[PDB]
Design a protein around this motif. Sequence first.
Motif, PDB file in Angstrom:
ATOM      1  N   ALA A 288      -2.962 -43.288 -33.575  1.00 59.96           N
ATOM      2  CA  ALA A 288      -1.899 -42.193 -32.943  1.00 59.96           C
ATOM      3  C   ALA A 288      -2.026 -40.908 -33.835  1.00 59.96           C
ATOM      4  O   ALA A 288      -2.781 -39.682 -33.290  1.00 59.96           O
ATOM      5  CB  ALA A 288      -0.470 -42.697 -33.054  1.00 59.96           C
ATOM      6  N   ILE A 289      -1.481 -40.822 -35.085  1.00 60.83           N
ATOM      7  CA  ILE A 289      -1.672 -39.593 -36.015  1.00 60.83           C
ATOM      8  C   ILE A 289      -3.142 -38.791 -35.445  1.00 60.83           C
ATOM      9  O   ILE A 289      -3.155 -37.698 -35.499  1.00 60.83           O
ATOM     10  CB  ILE A 289      -1.396 -39.755 -37.235  1.00 60.83           C
ATOM     11  N   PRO A 290      -4.166 -39.693 -36.054  1.00 63.90           N
ATOM     12  CA  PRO A 290      -5.644 -39.052 -35.957  1.00 63.90           C
ATOM     13  C   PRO A 290      -5.890 -38.304 -34.526  1.00 63.90           C
ATOM     14  O   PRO A 290      -6.044 -37.258 -34.374  1.00 63.90           O
ATOM     15  CB  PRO A 290      -6.605 -40.172 -36.103  1.00 63.90           C
ATOM     16  N   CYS A 291      -5.605 -39.284 -33.692  1.00 63.51           N
ATOM     17  CA  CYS A 291      -5.621 -38.801 -32.131  1.00 63.51           C
ATOM     18  C   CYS A 291      -4.886 -37.374 -31.862  1.00 63.51           C
ATOM     19  O   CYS A 291      -5.622 -36.415 -31.267  1.00 63.51           O
ATOM     20  CB  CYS A 291      -5.116 -39.903 -31.189  1.00 63.51           C
ATOM     21  N   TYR A 292      -3.702 -37.300 -32.261  1.00 65.44           N
ATOM     22  CA  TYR A 292      -2.931 -36.012 -32.002  1.00 65.44           C
ATOM     23  C   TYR A 292      -3.222 -34.824 -32.904  1.00 65.44           C
ATOM     24  O   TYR A 292      -3.097 -33.718 -32.452  1.00 65.44           O
ATOM     25  CB  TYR A 292      -1.366 -36.424 -32.129  1.00 65.44           C
ATOM     26  N   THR A 293      -3.722 -35.211 -33.983  1.00 63.20           N
ATOM     27  CA  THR A 293      -4.086 -34.240 -35.137  1.00 63.20           C
ATOM     28  C   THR A 293      -5.338 -33.514 -34.502  1.00 63.20           C
ATOM     29  O   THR A 293      -5.178 -32.203 -34.646  1.00 63.20           O
ATOM     30  CB  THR A 293      -4.283 -34.976 -36.583  1.00 63.20           C
ATOM     31  N   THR A 294      -6.340 -34.278 -34.383  1.00 62.49           N
ATOM     32  CA  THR A 294      -7.454 -33.688 -33.706  1.00 62.49           C
ATOM     33  C   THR A 294      -7.337 -32.744 -32.344  1.00 62.49           C
ATOM     34  O   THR A 294      -7.524 -31.569 -32.288  1.00 62.49           O
ATOM     35  CB  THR A 294      -8.681 -34.759 -33.240  1.00 62.49           C
ATOM     36  N   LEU A 295      -6.546 -33.379 -31.377  1.00 62.59           N
ATOM     37  CA  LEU A 295      -6.205 -32.860 -30.254  1.00 62.59           C
ATOM     38  C   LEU A 295      -5.375 -31.479 -30.405  1.00 62.59           C
ATOM     39  O   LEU A 295      -5.268 -30.612 -29.631  1.00 62.59           O
ATOM     40  CB  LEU A 295      -5.513 -33.692 -29.251  1.00 62.59           C
ATOM     41  N   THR A 296      -4.565 -31.415 -31.587  1.00 65.68           N
ATOM     42  CA  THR A 296      -4.067 -30.225 -31.961  1.00 65.68           C
ATOM     43  C   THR A 296      -5.108 -29.045 -32.276  1.00 65.68           C
ATOM     44  O   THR A 296      -4.834 -27.910 -31.808  1.00 65.68           O
ATOM     45  CB  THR A 296      -2.823 -30.313 -33.116  1.00 65.68           C
ATOM     46  N   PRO A 301      -1.405 -25.425 -28.817  1.00 68.90           N
ATOM     47  CA  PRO A 301      -0.287 -25.593 -28.020  1.00 68.90           C
ATOM     48  C   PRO A 301       0.185 -26.979 -27.757  1.00 68.90           C
ATOM     49  O   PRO A 301       0.744 -27.419 -26.679  1.00 68.90           O
ATOM     50  CB  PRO A 301      -0.601 -24.616 -26.790  1.00 68.90           C
ATOM     51  N   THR A 302      -0.619 -28.076 -28.183  1.00 66.43           N
ATOM     52  CA  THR A 302      -0.262 -29.371 -28.163  1.00 66.43           C
ATOM     53  C   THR A 302       0.460 -29.971 -29.034  1.00 66.43           C
ATOM     54  O   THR A 302       0.971 -31.348 -29.195  1.00 66.43           O
ATOM     55  CB  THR A 302      -1.492 -30.414 -27.645  1.00 66.43           C
ATOM     56  N   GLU A 303       0.849 -29.254 -30.349  1.00 63.42           N
ATOM     57  CA  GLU A 303       1.160 -29.778 -31.405  1.00 63.42           C
ATOM     58  C   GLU A 303       2.590 -30.431 -31.557  1.00 63.42           C
ATOM     59  O   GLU A 303       2.944 -31.277 -32.319  1.00 63.42           O
ATOM     60  CB  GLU A 303       1.326 -28.417 -32.540  1.00 63.42           C
ATOM     61  N   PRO A 304       3.405 -29.783 -30.745  1.00 63.39           N
ATOM     62  CA  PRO A 304       4.799 -30.605 -30.324  1.00 63.39           C
ATOM     63  C   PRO A 304       4.531 -32.234 -30.244  1.00 63.39           C
ATOM     64  O   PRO A 304       5.451 -32.868 -30.744  1.00 63.39           O
ATOM     65  CB  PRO A 304       5.369 -30.042 -29.211  1.00 63.39           C
ATOM     66  N   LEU A 305       3.475 -32.637 -29.861  1.00 62.95           N
ATOM     67  CA  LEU A 305       3.289 -33.873 -29.499  1.00 62.95           C
ATOM     68  C   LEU A 305       2.930 -34.540 -30.981  1.00 62.95           C
ATOM     69  O   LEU A 305       3.215 -35.856 -31.102  1.00 62.95           O
ATOM     70  CB  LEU A 305       2.053 -34.246 -28.724  1.00 62.95           C
ATOM     71  N   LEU A 306       2.197 -33.780 -31.878  1.00 63.12           N
ATOM     72  CA  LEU A 306       2.026 -34.376 -32.998  1.00 63.12           C
ATOM     73  C   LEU A 306       3.017 -34.431 -34.055  1.00 63.12           C
ATOM     74  O   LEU A 306       3.090 -35.225 -35.184  1.00 63.12           O
ATOM     75  CB  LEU A 306       0.742 -33.429 -33.635  1.00 63.12           C
ATOM     76  N   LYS A 307       3.958 -33.548 -33.656  1.00 66.70           N
ATOM     77  CA  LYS A 307       5.107 -33.384 -34.679  1.00 66.70           C
ATOM     78  C   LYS A 307       6.065 -34.807 -34.463  1.00 66.70           C
ATOM     79  O   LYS A 307       6.489 -35.550 -35.116  1.00 66.70           O
ATOM     80  CB  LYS A 307       6.084 -32.106 -34.352  1.00 66.70           C
TER      81      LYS A 307
END
Length: 324
Positions: A288-296, A301-307
């Motif tokens: 998850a984290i890696p997945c959202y970190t990259t995608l950020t 503008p997708t960083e709310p997901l990673l937060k």
Amino acid sequence: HMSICTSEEWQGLMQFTLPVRLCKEIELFHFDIGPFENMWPGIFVYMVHRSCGTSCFELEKLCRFIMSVKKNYRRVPYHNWKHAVTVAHCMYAILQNNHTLFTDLERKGLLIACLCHDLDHRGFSNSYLQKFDHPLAALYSTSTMEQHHFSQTVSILQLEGHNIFSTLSSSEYEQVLEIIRKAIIATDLALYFGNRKQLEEMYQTGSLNLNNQSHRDRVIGLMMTACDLCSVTKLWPVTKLTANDIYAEFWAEGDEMKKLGIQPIPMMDRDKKDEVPQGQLGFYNAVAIPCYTTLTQILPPTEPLLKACRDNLSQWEKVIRGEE
Ligand SMILES: COc1ccc(Cc2nccc3cc(OC)c(OC)cc23)cc1OC
Ligand SMILES: [Mg+2]
Ligand SMILES: [Zn+2]
């Protein structure tokens, strides 16, 4: 082998009007569709219209399509109609904050992809279907289930009056099936790790380019892994609630492995619930984290997901430390 919706079901969907309060709340990442079960079909339709135009698809065609999609998702614990719309909304959320970066065609295909990405799942993983040689594994050697999903999608388009893509040109038509196929296949977690590892390197060395079709398919790919996991990105009481649905499914599978004398992985062993908070932390860290970190880094503008994902990690860590 399909289920056509009854002639009364799709008629009701056309009469649907979304309440004003929801319209503004939908735009948010952390939005949860759960409280609004009977409103789900009209929630998708609304997300389409806002992203593709109130006249992009014939409305009578979209309604036969959507209701035939719902009627072809099984009544399993997790990979069900609710997952479809949940995964589709995270897409619509990523799209809205990145609208111009994707083409009218892509966006059409990606929303249909999500809704359909999981079509007619049986709550049985690839691992199982290959491991004990199911028909579907023989037909599709790798990404066994994924490929059945894509086929089911196309089967529904072939249904009389269902083909929402008719008005598209033959060049575009085949183009959008390739966007959709790639997208559905991209949701195979097997493929995920190659994908994230590559995209990371392409970014760190400044070699990423969105007009490079190869790169393009991979960014789309990660969006597919983000949307697919997104229950890791909602408020904790929702996240945890879905976790119960997830394991409900794994454990039903492990029981079958037990029956055929094969020790299922701790993860699918119902008699092993204590190890769960561990597995989740392992999964959040590994995936998850890696997945959202990259995608950020790719799409800021997708960083709310990673937060939200990090918040859900603190909670799991808190469970481990005996604070729940
Ligand atoms: C093979 O089936 C699945 C694949 C992915 C998921 C998504 C998911 N969400 C939250 C936590 C998860 C935690 C996991 O590991 C413990 C995991 O395994 C790949 C998947 C997880 C659920 C699934 O459940 C059916
Ligand atoms: Mg899947
Ligand atoms: Zn899915």
